[PDB]
């Protein structure tokens, strides 16, 4: 036996918290995905710039 | 013969300059590489 | 006024899901905080390197 | 006499070598400078 009104109240509060927390997780996960993507692009361009720099250094005396 | 003097007036300077530029370029390549860690 | 056993099961399941989602959000938030911190450090060092480069170019 | 001609030839050779050194160092300095300016702009682009 439980407190019927209390478990109804807790059911509703848990559902509210779960929506809020899922939304916070999806938003933060998307922010992290965007950050990782931007960093990967940066590292690709950095590699290109390193290679161009060494090419100049090799051609230069 | 002053053509030699005037034409060599900035030889030592341009050598020092190219050394400093080369050093900065090498340091930049190392720094860029450090960003990939 | 409800199905008592059914709301008990649903409440237990909601609590399990909320723990799982809270943990995922906290872990992901921590990873993002770490990434932001690392990027901030990179941008500071980049600033110093730009300034040194412009100083060398200016002296030349 | 012919010694003045020989020393004039030596002066011309020294001018040629000095000009070659100068133009080569200008070429090198130019390429290095351009790479450094490009790198400064790239680094700045990373701050956006
Ligand atoms: Cl470039
Ligand atoms: Zn009940």
Numbering used by the authors:
A (entry chain B): 1081 to 1141
B (entry chain C): 508 to 544
C (entry chain A): 1081 to 1140
D (entry chain D): 497 to 544
Task: Please give sentences taken from the publication describing this entry.
In flies, Centrosomin (Cnn) forms a phosphorylation-dependent scaffold that recruits proteins to the mitotic centrosome, but how Cnn assembles into a scaffold is unclear.
Although the N-terminal half of CM2 formed a canonical coiled coil, the C-terminal half adopted an unusual “splayed” conformation that wrapped around and clasped the coiled coil of the LZ. A splayed C terminus was also observed in crystals of CM2 alone, indicating it is a feature of the CM2 sequence rather than being driven by the interaction with the LZ. Assembly of the LZ:CM2 tetramer buried the canonical Leu residues that define the LZ (L528, L532, L535, L539, L542) (blue asterisks, Figure 2A; blue residues, Figure 4A), and also three residues that appear to be invariant within CM2 domains across species (Ile1126, Thr1133, and Leu1137) (orange asterisks; Figure 4A, orange residues,). Two Cys residues conserved within Drosophila species in the LZ region (C521, C525) line the interior of the coiled coil, with C521 consistently forming a homotypic disulfide bond.
